[PDB]
């Protein structure tokens, strides 16, 4: 288990032997593999408590709610892991797992069957610091779902509403880091989001086309962006689409590629993308894109490098 | 073979109490203990002539019974001179319709009882064949009749035939046609039809029941020179042909049959002039073709295309057609067993689910236990409605597993409420889960139900 190592290497707090995650910590987890300087571990204070709770009640309940909360809050093992898998696989039919926990059939919970909603979606260094064994801290999550005290109810709507937002802040969060700060990224900063993970057999190739074939052009915004990484997530129809193409001995060009998009997601991908992911994995020149390769860094960066 | 024997054969043997047609109580070989409502009586009736068990070799109740058969067609004023002038083999016909209907109710087949003992025996098998009796157990009306018509047990020693390892070894022989031969090799095995039209040549045809039998594991008898092989509404007519499947249609269908409707989208908007789902003739022959990979007749070929071969397929209108391909082999495969009154044993349903898993006798050997009452068609189609979402039902069934919920008859209903958008009745439960558990309790192996109903459901392999 890689997440394992993940938790431990950015976790910043101990309690009683477990440790724990602040939103600012785990943020930094999912875009990042090592940091260049390790976090300081600390013994959870009761300060934090006091502060776990004022946070909740001042940070934005939407796409920012990791950014605005930061250090004042509180992510269990079990949590983290919980989120992980929202992020690395967004498709698990939580409905219909949320349905089975369903209470009174109105399609939300209660915090007790809570615990529950987060191990049987994410299942299937520290050992015994790491496991699924039960919390008496309130965590975050728990108090933002189901209230301070633990009497309010999850709905369906506001959960799904969770996870897109949850989504939706990683990708305008890794838009800004891998942007440099500016509001455009840059055709060759496009590249190195999605290669980030990469570290299979042609990176040489892949980054010899960032560096070479691919420095000039319109840059690409934000919702150019987002638009990409939502496609990303549909990219197993998108896979289906692409082996019919190898079965009909047919290469896959730019038309084609297009074409696979709108029947995979939907929607279309802005010029800029679609010429930066051909510059990088044309790797002939032969303006024939290599599919099976695009597709196998596409897995990097859904996976996040933790094997998903 | 003897009166016995034959009425075994058409009246099954049943070891406990249940009830005929009408409301009587019933056991035995068609025995009839009373006609009181109360259950009580007839196990206190069927004591006092067995001596206190509802239970094999206690079979004298059906030799008392023929005995009796005789004696009351022998008092009485119009059954007694026709049974006087037949043989041996005629008067055994003659007690089973007794046995069928007592003595009252054959005695008034007055013509054909009199053509019977004028030695008429064509005549009196034409005309039987044309009254209620035989429409309402149309199967046992034609041994009898044959029985009566030609003087001899040919009609049940058909039917007599139940040894499993000589018919085992065809049934090995004949799985492995199907499963590793070239469709060319498998196509003419199974097909039984040729059609002449000396313009052009001889060609090999075969019957919707012959192509169900060519992909369901577990030769040419006619020839055509406008007959009807197929029911009122099926998809086989738009094949043209009087409903007979080409060699380019036995191609055609199974791959629709055992393709998922979203990969058959996907293909669609892909090769698709506009994406949109619509696609020509020829952009149709490559999509079906790739899909085959993961010459088609010129009846069909007009159908979707019109006959011009220049209209359009929409992915909504061939999806329909698969849809309904998809029922009428599932229909023409259920009536491939003994559809008594529309409901087949639970025992062969059981046949069904494991089809294409081959050596599965061993899960279907402690199926057995448990055991009754029929399966409707509509019970059964809607399991195959199920399996259509097995992906998506065997996400639910590790979930339910994992938070500890038990995997018995109210989750997999309720799943397949949840996921599949239909109702599991109350029996198709009891056999999938005889047959599943596997240990005895009231929980399913998810994960290996899931495995051969992955197979069931597309017709393949694991």
């Known amino acids: 288990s890689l997440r394992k190592q993940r938790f431990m290497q950015f976790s910043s707090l101990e309690h009683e032997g477990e440790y724990y995650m602040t939103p600012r910590d785990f943020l930094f987890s999912v875009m990042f593999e090592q940091m260049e300087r390790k976090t300081s571990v600390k013994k959870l204070t009761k300060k934090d408590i006091e502060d776990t709770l004022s946070g909740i009640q001042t940070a934005g309940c939407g796409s920012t709610f990791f950014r605005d909360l930061g250090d004042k809050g509180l992510i269990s093992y079990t949590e983290y892991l919980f989120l992980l898998t929202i992020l690395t696989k967004p498709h698990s039919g939580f409905h219909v797992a949320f349905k089975m926990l369903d209470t009174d059939g109105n399609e939300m919970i209660e915090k007790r069957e809570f615990f529950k909603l987060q191990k049987i979606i994410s299942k299937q260094t520290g050992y015994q610091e790491a496991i699924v064994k039960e919390p008496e801290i309130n965590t975050t999550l728990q108090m933002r779902f189901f209230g301070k005290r633990g009497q309010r109810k999850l709905h369906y709507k506001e959960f799904r509403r969770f996870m897109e937002n949850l989504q939706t802040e990683i990708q305008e969060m890794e838009f800004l880091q891998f942007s440099k700060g500016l509001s455009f990224m840059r055709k060759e900063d496009f590249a190195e989001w999605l290669l980030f993970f990469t570290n299979t057999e042609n990176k040489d190739i892949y980054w010899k086309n960032v560096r070479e074939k691919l420095s000039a052009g319109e840059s690409i915004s934000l919702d150019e962006f987002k638009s990409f990484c939502h496609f990303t997530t549909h990219l197993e129809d998108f896979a289906i689409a692409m082996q019919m193409f190898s079965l009909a001995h047919r290469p896959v060009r730019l038309a084609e590629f297009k074409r696979a998009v709108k029947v995979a997601t939907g929607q279309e991908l802005s010029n ?10 044309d790797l002939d020149g032969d303006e024939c894109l290599s599919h099976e390769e695009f597709l196998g860094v596409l897995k990097n960066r859904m996976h996040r490098g933790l094997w998903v | 073979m003897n009166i016995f024997e034959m009425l075994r054969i058409d009246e099954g043997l049943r070891l406990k109490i249940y009830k005929d047609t009408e409301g009587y109580y019933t056991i035995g070989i068609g025995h009839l203990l ?9 196990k ?13 070799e206690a079979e004298k109740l059906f030799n008392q019974d023929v005995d009796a058969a005789v004696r009351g067609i022998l008092r009485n004023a119009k059954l007694k001179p026709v049974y006087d002038s037949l043989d041996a083999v005629r008067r055994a016909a003659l007690i089973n319709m007794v046995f069928q209907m ?17 030695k008429r025996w064509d005549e009196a098998a034409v005309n039987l064949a044309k009254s209620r009796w035989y429409n309402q157990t149309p199967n046992r009306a034609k041994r009898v009749i044959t ?35 070239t469709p060319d090799k498998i196509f003419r095995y199974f097909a039984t039809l040729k059609v002449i039209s000396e313009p052009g040549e001889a060609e090999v045809f075969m019957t919707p029941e012959d192509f169900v039998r060519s992909i369901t594991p577990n030769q040419y008898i006619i020839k055509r020179f406008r007959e009807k092989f197929a029911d009122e509404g099926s998809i086989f007519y738009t094949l043209g042909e009087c409903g007979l499947i080409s060699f380019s249609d036995y191609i055609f269908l199974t791959t629709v049959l055992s393709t998922p409707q979203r990969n058959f ?10 994406g ?10 490559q999509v079906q073709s790739i899909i085959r990979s993961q010459g088609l007749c010129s009846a069909l070929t007009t159908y979707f295309f019109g006959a011009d071969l220049k209209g359009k397929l929409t992915i909504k209108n061939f999806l329909e057609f698969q849809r309904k391909l998809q029922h009428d082999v599932l229909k023409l495969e259920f009536e491939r067993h003994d559809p008594v009154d529309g409901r087949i044993t639970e025992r062969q349903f059981g046949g069904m689910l494991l089809a294409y898993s081959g050596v599965q006798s061993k899960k279907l050997t402690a199926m057995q236990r448990q055991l009754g009452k029929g399966l409707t068609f509509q019970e059964v189609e809607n399991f195959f409605t199920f399996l259509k979402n097995i992906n998506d039902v065997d996400t639910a069934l590790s979930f339910y597993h994992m938070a500890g919920a038990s995997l018995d008859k109210v989750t997999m209903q309720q799943v397949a409420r949840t996921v599949a958008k239909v109702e599991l009745s109350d029996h198709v439960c009891d056999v999938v889960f005889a047959l599943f558990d596997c240990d005895g309790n009231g929980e399913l192996s998810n994960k290996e139900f899931v495995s051969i109903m992955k197979q069931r459901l597309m017709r393949g392999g694991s």
């Open chain 2, 34 to 42: 009373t006609k009181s409502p109360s259950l009580n009586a007839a």
């Open chain 2, 147 to 181: 029985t009566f018509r030609t003087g001899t047990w040919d009609a049940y020693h058909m039917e007599e035939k139940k040894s499993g390892f000589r018919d085992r070894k065809v049934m090995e022989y004949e799985n492995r046609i199907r499963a590793y031969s």
């Open chain 1, 272 to 281: 800029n993308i679609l010429d930066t992911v051909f510059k990088i994995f």
């Open chain 2, 44 to 56: 206190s009736e069927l004591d006092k002539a067995i001596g206190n068990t509802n239970g094999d």
């Open chain 2, 102 to 118: 007592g003595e009252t109710g054959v005695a008034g087949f007055t013509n054909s009882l009199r053509m019977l003992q004028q």
């Open chain 2, 276 to 285: 949109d789902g619509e696609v020509d003739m020829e952009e149709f022959e």
């Open chain 2, 265 to 274: 989208e996907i293909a669609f908007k892909m090769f698709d002039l506009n």
